[PDB]
Structure 1
Amino acid sequence: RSGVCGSVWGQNDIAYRCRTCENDPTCAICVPCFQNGDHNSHDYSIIYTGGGCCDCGDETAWKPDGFCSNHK
């Protein structure tokens, strides 16, 4: 598909998985969204998803505690 962050990354591009904040293992947020949130204690990792759309601000894909400062 096409406030929620509209950022996107490509096949070779990195993003962040956070197992604490994710609704399911396919969820992920862009680097700026991760850096503007607080995951210090969380089980996070840099990934190459092979592309995707950022789930920051999407209550159905990400826990609101894990939203960055700019998306809710």
Structure 2
Amino acid sequence: VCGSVWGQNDLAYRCRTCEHDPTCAICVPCFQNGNHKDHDYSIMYTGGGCCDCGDTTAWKREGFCSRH
């Protein structure tokens, strides 16, 4: 599971296609290294947080990056 943490003024990605709930998010590198073509994604601020990439409780497996 990605160990990335970020702060309130750090960009991250939401992906409505991949998420298990509206609060889920993944770090920019995990987004870049995954497959979200034609997904409903948004680069945005998230109030900071921890990456959900690799976490099957938070994020769909098809939305995991190459590295997790």
| Structure 2 SS opposite 1:17 | strand
Match of 1:57 in 2: 54
Structure 2: which 5+ runs fail to align? Answer: none
TM-score by length of 2: 0.98
Q: Distance in 1 between matches of 2:32 and 2:10?
A: 16
The alignment of Structure 1 onto Structure 2 pairs a total of residues equal to 68
**Moved segments of 4+, more than 4 Å:** none
TM-score by length of 1: 0.93
Equivalent positions of 1:1-72 (< 5 A) are 4-71=1-68
Q: Distance in 1 between matches of 2:43 and 2:33?
A: 15
Give the C-alpha shift of residue 47 in structure 1: 1.4
- RMSD between superposed Cα atoms in Å: 0.4
Structure 1: which 5+ runs fail to align? Answer: none
% identical aligned pairs = 85
